[PDB]
Symmetry: C3
Subunit: 308 residues, 3 copies
């Protein structure tokens, strides 16, 4: 079914899923089959699920269907290089969580929705969007012919939905910083315990962050181009901010676009590098993600000093 190069390269952390949208669902199915065997998801339901999820992603520059699949791939690479650490249901739940983690994203951050006084901010006070992304996942599961978890027991159903809920909520980067701080203290004290469910939850949350930010772990040309999509959303949000009468944070002001390289150094130094560093400590086979991140940091440093 899938090409030769894709079957080889899909195992690489820095794999790009390519421009051909119609290939991505099969990419995702292949990944699902190759983690949880060909035997646990009914292929007609699964594809009906995938295609409905795709439909509920929006045509935004970055937080789109392609991002969903790119994020799911990263999890696949992590899961594939840490065999026997996670359960069958976890590998299912995490792959589906990643695919659905940005469902119905409109390009705006939680802060804007708050400032806009959006209805979703009234419903979900914290992790507004991420709570909506989970709510959307449920609703798609509850469509006729879409319940990909019908073969599971009721207990396993609740279990996997809880795995998915927590993993999607972890993609709220506001939660990353505390999580990663906790995990860092657990590692340095030697107290991190993967048999501890609370600890597992945090490690899963950090895995989710690592996957969500994985654009920074690709090769320079991919990383550089995706950066345009990211800022295209930030600047559109800064515009909407100015339309509300609020002077947006500099990152979101297209008039300050000359400062993108500096904003990137900021992001890598405060978020990306610490994230992959901590993940590599906990899961050493994720080293390539960190190496690629360090490499892209140097590229941004080359950009800054005029060597682009």
């Amino acid at each position: 079914n899938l090409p030769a190069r894709i079957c080889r390269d899909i195992e690489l952390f820095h794999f790009d899923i390519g421009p051909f949208e119609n290939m991505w669902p099969g990419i995702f199915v292949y990944m699902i089959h190759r983690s949880c065997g060909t035997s646990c998801f009914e292929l007609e339901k699964l594809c009906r699920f995938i295609m409905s999820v795709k439909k509920n992603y929006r045509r935004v520059p970055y937080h789109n269907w392609k991002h969903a699949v790119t994020v799911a791939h990263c999890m696949y690479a992590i899961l594939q290089n840490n065999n026997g650490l996670f359960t069958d249901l976890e590998r299912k739940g995490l792959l589906i969580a990643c695919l659905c983690h940005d469902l119905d994203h409109r390009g705006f951050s939680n802060s804007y929705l708050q400032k806009f006084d959006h209805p979703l901010a009234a419903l979900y006070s914290t992790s507004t969007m991420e709570q909506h992304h989970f709510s959307q996942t449920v609703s798609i599961l509850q469509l006729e012919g879409h319940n990909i978890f019908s073969t599971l027991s009721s207990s396993e159903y609740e279990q996997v939905l809880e795995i998915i809920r927590k993993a999607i909520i972890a993609t709220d980067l506001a939660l990353y910083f505390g999580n990663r701080k906790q995990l860092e203290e657990m590692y340095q004290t030697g107290s991190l315990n993967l048999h501890n469910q609370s600890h597992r939850d945090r490690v899963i949350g950090l895995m989710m962050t690592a996957c969500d930010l994985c654009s920074v772990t690709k090769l320079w040309p991919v990383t550089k181009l995706t950066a345009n999509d990211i800022y295209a959303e930030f600047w559109a949000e800064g515009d909407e901010m100015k339309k509300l009468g609020i002077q947006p944070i500099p990152m979101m002001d297209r008039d300050k676009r000359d400062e993108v390289p500096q904003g990137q150094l900021g992001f890598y130094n405060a978020v990306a590098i610490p994230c992959y560093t901590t993940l590599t400590q906990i899961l050493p086979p994720t080293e390539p993600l960190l190496k690629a991140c360090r490499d892209n940091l140097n590229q941004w440093e080359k950009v800054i000093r005029g060597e682009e």
Copy 2:
């Protein structure tokens, strides 16, 4: 249903309707209910109407669904601050006219359609697009389950359709100049008579112009950004003009984009300021529209002299 901020701010003339498309129909329904009570439009038909109208707007940069709703809002603010001046049917008709006034707009002016020898120019010699926008409104009303005026008598139906026809045709800016000149002489002579149906018609036409141009009555950041959308259409039309072998008017030539500030001073001085000035004379509670216009004129003057 609607957010707290929106319920407060929607009463302000300079209210922006925001980036969330799915909120606009409820914004429009709220406005309709709050002008004509919750009791005269059957909510299932009304929403079926609104969603069909939305479907027949095109994905053009400016004359799109968002513009339709923005224009309808302005009318709502005018109508809300001039209570008892207009009838129930007028407030209904004008709100619906505004929503439908640009139905099936493809980003091109009447002059281009003429020069293109477009079929619609053969059907409607004058006010080509505006006659088509009305024709489109009728056709959507005549869809099964879409006749939002079924509770009305036949007489009131004809009446309201005539209100709508005239108001949509008034959005042809070629007609503005004569209308506003007449209204200006009627005011200065003391002969303007709102009990005179012919006079009312003109005032309604000027209200329609004021609403249609209301982008110039928003706060600078909104006004400035919408200006890009306006010129994005003008330049696309100037391109099509050059493709016909006709050197377009400078406003429509993207090579002369450096002259946008001057074109804006031209527009405000000849069209916008006179329009809101005359409206404020006739309807004093519309003063804020004029103040905002004067403010934006100064911003364009700041742009011109390099203070942006």
Copy 3:
């Protein structure tokens, strides 16, 4: 049905089909009727065919539905100015081939699909896309109510599908160079024989090239603007190339966009001028296509030396 200007201008080689998408199918039907009479295509099936073909074109900057119709028009002008040279079925087949020749084009060249290891490259080793475009044409013909060739005999059906297959495959510009070389030797030796089916096939292939490149035979403003769409695709492909780790050919590198004028001189000198020159030798009434091409070459030369 069609406007007055269009009925006049549609006979001109450099006719632009305009910005109004909804007019193009009638433009194509008019062209089909005016080549093969109003009597051989059943209008309800034909329009069902046209609208299905349109649906299977993608929203890419250049190789889109508009291009399809523009290419079909050029064939119409060639066919109209060389009466009695081609058969009824040929004129049908070639008009339909042109409409379908880029069906499901995603903006990428055969080389990229190859380098990507795309599945279509496995199915069709040579002329990958063009073989897929033909495969897509067949599939649309085989839809219920879409078989526009049902009035034909089985023999004439095979015949016309073979005409279409060869003409679509000829739009692979890799094949142009050999074809045109052969045709050039046949002309200079006096051995070209239009009663020779093999020779006819080549002339048809060159006609297809001439139609496909016809953007270079329009008036400067059309030619210049379409060039942006062409490079918008090339640069997107060069991006995807860099994402695969391959440094793309300079034409496809947006960083080398300053070299577009030179790339154009290259293209006209090596491909376009030779193509129309050879066509004018074989079909003298196609001279205007060559004149327009030479004119645009001078415009590109004016651009180069700073006279834009």
